Structure formats: structure tokens, C-alpha cells
């Protein structure tokens, strides 16, 4: 066996945060956004 390579890709992969971005909408806001995005504007 050569079990001394576990997690090699995990260790060698670089590191990035998830930036700032916007507070993702919840409740009815996301559904309304999706509906208006997918029916009214498109044609």
C-alpha cells in the first residue's frame, strides 16, 4: 500500500473566499423575481 497520499488534491487546491455578493431574496420575492424573469420579458 501507499496510503500516504490521502487528501492530496484537497491540500494542493488553492483557497478562495465567497466574496460579498447580495443578500439572496427569500419568501415571495424570489418567486416573483423568477416569474417575471421567465415569462414577461422573454419573447
Amino acid at each position: 500500500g501507499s496510503l500516504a497520499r490521502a487528501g492530496k488534491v484537497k491540500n494542493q487546491t488553492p483557497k478562495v473566499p465567497k466574496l460579498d455578493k447580495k443578500k439572496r431574496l427569500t419568501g415571495r420575492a424570489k418567486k416573483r423575481q423568477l416569474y417575471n424573469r421567465r415569462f414577461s420579458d422573454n419573447g
Binding site: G1, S2, L3, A6, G7, K8, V9, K10, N11
Partner: protein, 48 residues
């Protein structure tokens, strides 16, 4: 629940070509041997 004992690599089917980090465990409920594959690439060292 069981007790980890030793670490031995296990091979795979012929079309595949890789190694699997499988660990043998001695159960306390019955007192038998089992072999279990550890998930996660770095979790092999994450266990005592």
C-alpha cells in the same frame, strides 16, 4: 458502533484503476469483523 483497528488499501474493478482507503472494524454489539470505506479524501488522517 465499533473500534477501528488497522488500515489497509483495497483495489477496485479492472476497468477502474485506483486505490480505496478501507478500514477494518471490530464490532462491540456482536464481536465481528467488518470492512468499511471511509468517505472524503482527507478523512483517512482525520481518524484516530
Amino acid at each position: 458502533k465499533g473500534i477501528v483497528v488497522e488500515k489497509v488499501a483495497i483495489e477496485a474493478k479492472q476497468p477502474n484503476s485506483a486505490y480505496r482507503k478501507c478500514v477494518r472494524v471490530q464490532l462491540i454489539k456482536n464481536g465481528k469483523k467488518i470492512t468499511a470505506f471511509v468517505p472524503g479524501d482527507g478523512c483517512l488522517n482525520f481518524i484516530d
